[model samples]
Target: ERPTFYRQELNKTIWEVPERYQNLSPVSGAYGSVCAAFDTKTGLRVAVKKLSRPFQSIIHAKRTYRELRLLKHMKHENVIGLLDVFTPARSLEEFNDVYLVTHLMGADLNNIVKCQKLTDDHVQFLIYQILRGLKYIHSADIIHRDLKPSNLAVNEDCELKILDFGLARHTDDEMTGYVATRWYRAPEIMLNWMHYNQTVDIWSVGCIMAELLTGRTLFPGTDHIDQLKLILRLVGTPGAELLKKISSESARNYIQSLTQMPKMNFANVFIANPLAVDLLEKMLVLDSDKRITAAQALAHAYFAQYHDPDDEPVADPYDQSFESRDLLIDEWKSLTYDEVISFVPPP
Candidate 1:
């Protein structure tokens, strides 16, 4: 029996659970690639996320590494910590690279909201906290292209930590930041435009805000075409002048069709208070130029109303001391990289 290795920083190494335990706990979540083990020693639970597969194979792995590199460079309170980097023992003979190991929280904001109806006041508070996390990431010149409920973790202590940076990009270079998901994607992305900035993340915040309020996906489109149609249905389509500004001709045509949707008032669309409706209108604008910046979003009256003057950001629930660490062992590390490759990584 081998003892777990410890380091000043997290080490990417083999985390296998014991085989004799008849009742081993299984873990799964939306970002499907990652698997977890309850640590037997420290009683701390850890997440062993394999950086092997993604929706877009090549692009995803690269961004996953980018997130790793980025996490190695900066640290923040609201964000999940990259506690350790794990490489399975050579004796295990499984992987060519290493696994990204971190701690786990109870549930994500998405799950919490889905499980219960939160008051408008509570929704606003969560939004403010999310923005605070965004502010920290953006200030470090990091752009989180995919910001949604699935990427957050909720711990036993009722805390939130921003997780899964696979879609994160460094904004220092405008050419490098290309990221978006179906529901939270910004108008620029929908139009097939190539150039966008950190403000794109703000648009996602707006989408999350809407989803939290309604307890449903704000843009529930089945495909890209339908996705744009959903946006048009919600915010109305952009005009010709806006269309002309888009670089991709395909995207422009899509935007044109999207604009043809029936007119609707986006300001009052969200289920939350009138103030949130006002904020959502500002954040989800068709024109990226008109989209609210993190600074402006922080200044929005909606955020101002919910901003807690004295609330402190306690330790991340996914940190070293979390209870999930008790089960990381033989079974978790038993899977080989081939297993990882075939297991169908994060969707």
Candidate 2:
């Protein structure tokens, strides 16, 4: 029988997962479960995630692959780091569960937004950090298709790190299937486009910023179609030029038939500074082409007080040419196990 606690050595460190610490639970989601643990060697408290049986479905396999690869390759203060990885099985054939270790954070942005305690400075700093992280991610030609409050990890000191890469993909790829959650999803994705770029992430950023300010989801829709209606209601309908870019005829027709509605007063809705509203307007553009870039977002007057020339550079200098491939369940499992083997644990 498997023990409640896992005590093992990886890369010469004593890692422990005490079963009693279930009380110290972190956030749990559909893809996996998270809990707080500690590294005995380094004496560091860490959050560990146990992925749902990754080989159960093709989608799960892809998520497990992308997350392990992206986290191992990405090195940034704003992005979550992989401190360790472990499995209970002794051989690849026995591998069924995978665990990932990361720095333990106080809470996620979802919890913070719910508390409704964020000040203007808190919002500004948090948004700056998110954009800073996105800037690094986009520079690698990668788009974090999942950019929501829940995926953002934060500590009490206002330190924030972007986590979860299950839906991330190369900017050049033509991704399909339901991508982001309804509210934070981009209009291009909701309209079912054949291709998209980094701007998809920017749209999510806008949704997150709006939620942070108002303490409510900007476009809380019941479904994808409903989501479109909510977006149109808030930002006004897309113009013919933008509508022509919509690949889905049904969506285009629906937008055309709807009466021309004026955009809601964002300033009144947010009750934030003029610069904040201006930046929000740029981010929530109906056209993906018009959405602000991460670099452009950081330069906006809303962030002028927090911007620093000496801060960590925005771009990652490392090679990001890692090829993404669709894999069958077994193949994906093999590749992931190999990655786990490569990184034993922390120093």
Candidate 3:
């Protein structure tokens, strides 16, 4: 018998485990059941990521919803796609699990960075794609708060796919707290700036670029305060003008009192490639406003050979207004469930 597509009216359109698929194995981590399966249906492999306790808490719920929404809306060669969104439950009462199907890559950048055989070409291509993804994401006025090597999926061919947008959100002043992995976090975030912008991702990119070149984390801080200290040691202490923007007086005072450290030349820190160093210097600027934008970084001399005016066109005019929701713990479960319910298409 042919496979039947079960479309329950006002319910999810459940996909039968295609007979062509062979379950290799399941790997558990932050995303829960991240299993690989051979899609005999298409003669390719696919990675299936099931949200880890999506409704476990409000924080989990919000992250799940945001990931779904952003993945659906963002369409770019460098960004990951939502191949399918599904739930195993037959009814809302039984619904607890949600799975996202995505294209599988050979390995993540984190693994690749650890490999000792990296070439300058490999580093350049990876940086190009990361910026390309950032250009698309920033154009939408969203910030990918968490950007580390593990979140960047890559293939052997140097094709990169920006993944794991669980912390991606719109830019606003009110968002202040510990966000992003400690090593890749920007100065504004560490000091709790009143408002920040998309440039925060640029700082992460610089950190990642440096890590790829050296095969070591640029700022490997053990804790929040230590992380700040490590960053200051490398990038040097920021000036008072930049410190004025810090929203927290304690953080501001602490930064001001720290003995100033001389900034290391990019050539000494990263690869000696002048173009690459220039791009990294611009990206790693302490002040968010002074940091280079993704588009600007893409057009820099380092990426000149790869850049194309046609490929990197200006973002089309669109309404910039978007609602930024902050959900409380008690409110998350119901709202997250509704988000899942809303995914079902009408008859």
Local accuracy by lDDT, each model: 0.62, 0.78, 0.74
Q: Write the per-residue lDDT of candidate 2 for residues 1-347, one digit (tens) a residue.
A: 23356565433333345442333445456787776766664576777787878778877876787788778877888998898777776679997778887887787888877775888788899999999888888887777888999889888889999987777865665765468777898888867575766788999998888888777888999987788888888798777777778878998898888888878887766667777788889999877777799988888888987887577465544333433555568888888888788885545
lDDT of 3 by residue, 1-347 (tens): 22323322111223334344566456466645576777665666888676767878766776776677777677788988877666656566766767677778888887876665787787888899899888888887778998999999888788989987778866666664567888898888766654666778988999999888777888898888898888878788877777777778998888878888878766776645777788888888877777798888888888876887688643332232423545575456555556555664212
Give stretches of model 3 more than 4 Å off: 1-21, 29-33, 313-347
Better of 1 and 3 by lDDT: 3
Q: Write the candidate numbers in order of decreasing lDDT.
A: 2, 3, 1
Cα lDDT over the full model 3: 0.74
Score residue 182 of candidate 2 by CA lDDT. Answer: 78
lDDT of 1 by residue, 1-347 (tens): 33354322123323342321112233443333465656554466777665543323434444444565556544666778776554434454543444566667787886787677677877776777777777777776677788888887866444577777766766543344345778788877655455777788888888888887887888888987777778878777677787788878877765555436655865445434788888888887878778887666766888777565354332222211221133233333333222333322121
RMSD of each: 9.7, 4.8, 5.2
| TM value for model 3 | 0.85
TM-score of each: 0.74, 0.87, 0.85
- Residue 250, model 1: lDDT of 75
